[PDB]
Amino acid sequence: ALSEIETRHSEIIKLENSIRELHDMFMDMAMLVESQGEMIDRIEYNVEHAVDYVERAVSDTKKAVK
Amino acid sequence: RADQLADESLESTRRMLQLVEESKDAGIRTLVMLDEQGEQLDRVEEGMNHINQDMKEAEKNLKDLGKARENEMDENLEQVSGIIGNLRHMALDMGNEIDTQNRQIDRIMEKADSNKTRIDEANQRATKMLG
Amino acid sequence: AEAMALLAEAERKVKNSQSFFSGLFGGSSKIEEACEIYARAANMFKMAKNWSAAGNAFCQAAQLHLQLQSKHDAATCFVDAGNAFKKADPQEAINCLMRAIEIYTDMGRFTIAAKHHISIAEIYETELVDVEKAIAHYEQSADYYKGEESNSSANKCLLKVAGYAAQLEQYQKAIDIYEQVGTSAMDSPLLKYSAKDYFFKAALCHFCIDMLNAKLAVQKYEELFPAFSDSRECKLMKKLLEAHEEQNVDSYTESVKEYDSISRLDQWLTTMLLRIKKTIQGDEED
Amino acid sequence: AEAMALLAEAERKVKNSQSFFSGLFGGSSKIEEACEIYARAANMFKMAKNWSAAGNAFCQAAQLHLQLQSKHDAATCFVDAGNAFKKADPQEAINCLMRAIEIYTDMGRFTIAAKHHISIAEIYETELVDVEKAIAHYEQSADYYKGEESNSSANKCLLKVAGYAAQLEQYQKAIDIYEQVGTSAMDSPLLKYSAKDYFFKAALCHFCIDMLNAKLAVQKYEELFPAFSDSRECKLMKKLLEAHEEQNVDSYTESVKEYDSISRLDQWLTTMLLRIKKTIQGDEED
Amino acid sequence: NRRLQQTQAQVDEVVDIMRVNVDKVLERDQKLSELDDRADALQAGASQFETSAAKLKRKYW
Amino acid sequence: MAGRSMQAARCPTDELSLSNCAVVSEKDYQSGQHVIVRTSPNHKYIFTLRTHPSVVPGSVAFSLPQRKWAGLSIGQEIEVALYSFDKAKQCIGTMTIEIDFLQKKNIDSNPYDTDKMAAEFIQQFNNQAFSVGQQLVFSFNDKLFGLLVKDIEAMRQKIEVGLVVGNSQVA
Structure with a gap:
């Protein structure tokens, strides 16, 4: 029936693009996961290094009393 | 009209499959990164605790010095359905992962400030012992 | 290495030294030691799953910490205490948190003041069930987040505020919140996708308005047929607005029946849609 | 707890000591204490929601910090001042922000300099509405990001630049940006997907184009019919190029209506499409 | 049609x-x-402290 | 209780005009109660109340049809008092009404199923008071009409004023 194959059309087009919008999110999100994935590249960097500077700080201070 | 309503829709179903499948790959990469980024944080946590423990040792010592078309078409539908219902699988997983790391970062930011203020106190309590 | 043992030594340590004990010096050096003791106790208490004991233990170490002058790490201890009581059997879950924020607030730490401010409003609702005090917090908290330009969290909290404000009859005061968070969301080409629901909520929330507050909010919204995300916002709304302007509680209840297929209604929507269905029924046979 | 009082004490201690006050040493030790004072003041000013007062207070604490020799934590204060003025009634914000960058820049902290730089132009566009000064910043900032290896961010900024450059009429200066951000987007198979819109924009922007500058940007494009994503880029473009080269403000305005079906047109697109829509009419009428 | 709306x-x-x-x-x-940014400004105040500590070393060691 | 001074007003909206109910304020009465208006020691009328936060405290609003029946004018003093019916002798069972078109420029001779009318008349005028010789407007399918009680019978004695219940047969 035309009322079926037709309703199907407007429904499928309202099914694919319904994924479009969703697809757009995976686009932006993915672009953000990598974007914010940069800060972590610095976090890991800073953290360990911050421990290096502090470690040298706790050492000198201890030897400054001995 | 039923000829251009089904076919076009078929070319439409094709777009769906690829769009989701091509996005799922990005989803994998996302989860793949979420896993790695998770380790990078489990390595940051070690710092927060390390810094708060060492600074406590510094202060003490410092203060010390101070003081068939509809058939295959329908077949694709069963595929789209199985993929979407699967898109949630990761969608949910990536959710827990985030909520997890997000919580871990909270403990970091907190301690981070406590350590920061402390390191500043040490610096100030260090420029007052010279001489 | 016994909990009670530590608690005891800790007690004998925490006390302003005087007379023979004081000798020549003292003060912070002792009270600090006691703090570390109680913390070490709270540790094994959370071990044996005593919680109550662990929480109160942290309360001890914390309060003592203040007696030394160290609000920072103290407040953090207050947090360990709050988390303890929360996931425990006694109360105090609310007190510890208030005692933590009173510190983070004055110390000039709003970033966190709001972090636990939301946890607070979350417990004062899911536990104490005090929506009127929860909203006050969700709100003031969003104010702080907005100050830190953390628009995101600011919105998270506002969404909570309005969301429960509607359940608390505060419909108009809710739509205002949706209007603000709705206008302060279009700026980001990433919230355009979410900006819908805001308009749907604001267009559903009715302070018993007789004019077209909704017929106007639906218009303020920009929609086109090619939308598929929109099909889950105004398309339905318009059909509900006509179903209200015509006292037809059959077109509204049938439309909610159809719409309840392509997009399920959460508890919130149901409660409000029901409230609107009642504004229609209570107006028809009458 | 008196802001006015703190603001006074801070003054009485913020002055190069001499005579019986200076003693043997001194200097930075005092001015720092003063900074802490004004900070505490701005803190309660924001507590009472006087913001403006809090902002100017931070301005004082910051300015003082410079007089100590500590550009770092100083600039951070300038930031706080900006967040205050922004979520306040005065307009100051911009100033503080500029004063922040000059520090992060001279210090070498370009990473954060750009982090704020983007927020700068973001305010000079959402507030002062001075795009001419916004683009300059989005650009100079993208240079820093692109220098910090950070390609993604650099592209975010470039997108801002070109995007608003076409609104200001700078079409060619926009297509160049789209071309570059397009060739530097394929090196990441995690961006190929979006590389479309870039070509679509670069081909839409017309500096009174008369030939095939766009037909050339659409031909350089590699569309894969079986790669359905492209259906939101070139396929339309070709039909528009024809509707342009054939002085037909109907085929173009009909194609915009159809494409507006399979793919919702956003603000930007609309504005530019209408501009091209008139370049045809005036040519039908010459 | 069912599998569609499904x-x-x-x-x-x-x-x-x-x-x-x-x-x-x-x-x-x-x-x-x-x-x-905070943790980044940490190494700034941490490095300086390590510097002043060097002085405490050359005068107390 | 025993009676209080009130002032006649106009119906709030056309909405409460198709209910044939005296609209009042929430600060005075409450929707559901019955009252007896007084204009003289011999002219007593009974209406049904319906609250609305638009009415002025100390006054009752009546529709045009009601004012043309009880002889009420916009700006007069009347004494209203609570009236409780006796569901045992004043319950309407068979009430004959003289239906008629309200507007002329819309009077059609087309068929009108009475069943649907007697079903909608009890669905809109239920738990209300009616008197012999009372005049009101009937809204059947958005079509304006006019009613005129001729005779009322209790669930056969004739009653002055009755209470239309759920199992009431209208003719």
Whole structure:
């Protein structure tokens, strides 16, 4: 029936693009996961290094009393 | 009209499959990164605790010095359905992962400030012992 | 290495030294030691799953910490205490948190003041069930987040505020919140996708308005047929607005029946849609 | 707890000591204490929601910090001042922000300099509405990001630049940006997907184009019919190029209506499409 | 026709998820940003302290 | 209780005009109660009340049809008092009404199923008071009409004023 194959059309087009919008999110999100994935590249960097500077700080201070 | 309503829709179903499948790959990469980024944080946590423990040792010592078309078409539908219902699988997983790391970062930011203020106190309590 | 043992030594340590004990010096050096003791106790208490004991233990170490002058790490201890009581059997879950924020607030730490401010409003609702005090917090908290330009969290909290404000009859005061968070969301080409629901909520929330507050909010919204995300916002709304302007509680209840297929209604929507269905029924046979 | 009082004490201690006050040493030790004072003041000013007062207070604490020799934590204060003025009634914000960058820049902290730089132009566009000064910043900032290896961010900024450059009429200066951000987007198979819109924009922007500058940007494009994503880029473009080269403000305005079906047109697109829509009419009428 | 409307809401079901996921990336924006800057200014105040400590070393060691 | 001074007003909106109910304020009465208006020691009328936060405290609003029946004018003093019916002798069972078109420029001779009318008349005028010789407007399918009680019978004695219940047969 035309009322079926037709309703199907407007429904499928309202099914694919319904994924479009969703697809757009995976686009932006993915672009953000990598974007914010940069800060972590610095976090890991800073953290360990911050421990290096502090470690040298706790050492000198201890030897400054001995 | 039923000829251009089904076919076009078929070319439409094709777009769906690829769009989701091509996005799922990005989803994998996302989860793949979420896993790695998770380790990078489990390595940051070690710092927060390390810094708060060492600074406590510094202060003490410092203060010390101070003081068939509809058939295959329908077949694709069963595929789209199985993929979407699967898109949630990761969608949910990536959710827990985030909520997890997000919580871990909270403990970091907190301690981070406590350590920061402390390191500043040490610096100030260090420029007052010279001489 | 016994909990009670530590608690005891800790007690004998925490006390302003005087007379023979004081000798020549003292003060912070002792009270600090006691703090570390109680913390070490709270540790094994959370071990044996005593919680109550662990929480109160942290309360001890914390309060003592203040007696030394160290609000920072103290407040953090207050947090360990709050988390303890929360996931425990006694109360105090609310007190510890208030005692933590009173510190983070004055110390000039709003970033966190709001972090636990939301946890607070979350417990004062899911536990104490005090929506009127929860909203006050969700709100003031969003104010702080907005100050830190953390628009995101600011919105998270506002969404909570309005969301429960509607359940608390505060419909108009809710739509205002949706209007603000709705206008302060279009700026980001990433919230355009979410900006819908805001308009749907604001267009559903009715302070018993007789004019077209909704017929106007639906218009303020920009929609086109090619939308598929929109099909889950105004398309339905318009059909509900006509179903209200015509006292037809059959077109509204049938439309909610159809719409309840392509997009399920959460508890919130149901409660409000029901409230609107009642504004229609209570107006028809009458 | 008196802001006015703190603001006074801070003054009485913020002055190069001499005579019986200076003693043997001194200097930075005092001015720092003063900074802490004004900070505490701005803190309660924001507590009472006087913001403006809090902002100017931070301005004082910051300015003082410079007089100590500590550009770092100083600039951070300038930031706080900006967040205050922004979520306040005065307009100051911009100033503080500029004063922040000059520090992060001279210090070498370009990473954060750009982090704020983007927020700068973001305010000079959402507030002062001075795009001419916004683009300059989005650009100079993208240079820093692109220098910090950070390609993604650099592209975010470039997108801002070109995007608003076409609104200001700078079409060619926009297509160049789209071309570059397009060739530097394929090196990441995690961006190929979006590389479309870039070509679509670069081909839409017309500096009174008369030939095939766009037909050339659409031909350089590699569309894969079986790669359905492209259906939101070139396929339309070709039909528009024809509707342009054939002085037909109907085929173009009909194609915009159809494409507006399979793919919702956003603000930007609309504005530019209408501009091209008139370049045809005036040519039908010459 | 059934399998059609059947797949519909299912897809939208994932769309509703991305929504929450998007709200998750925003949270990861506030944290990283401010924190990365704070922890970055840490090495600044930490390095200086290590410097002053060097002086305490050449006068007390 | 025993009676209080009130002032006649106009119906709030056309909405409460198709209910044939005296609209009052929430500060005075409450929707559901019955009252007896007084204009003289011999002219007593009974109406049904319906609250509305638009009415002025200390006054009752009546529709045009009601004012043309009880002889009420916009700006007069009347004494209203609570009236409780006796569901045992004043319950309407068979009431004959003289239906008629309200407007002329819309009077059609087309068929009108009475069943649907007697079903909608009890669905809109239920738990209300009616008197012999009372005049009101009937809204059947958005079509304006006019009624005129001729005779009322209790669930056969004739009653002055009755209470239309759920199992009431209208003719």
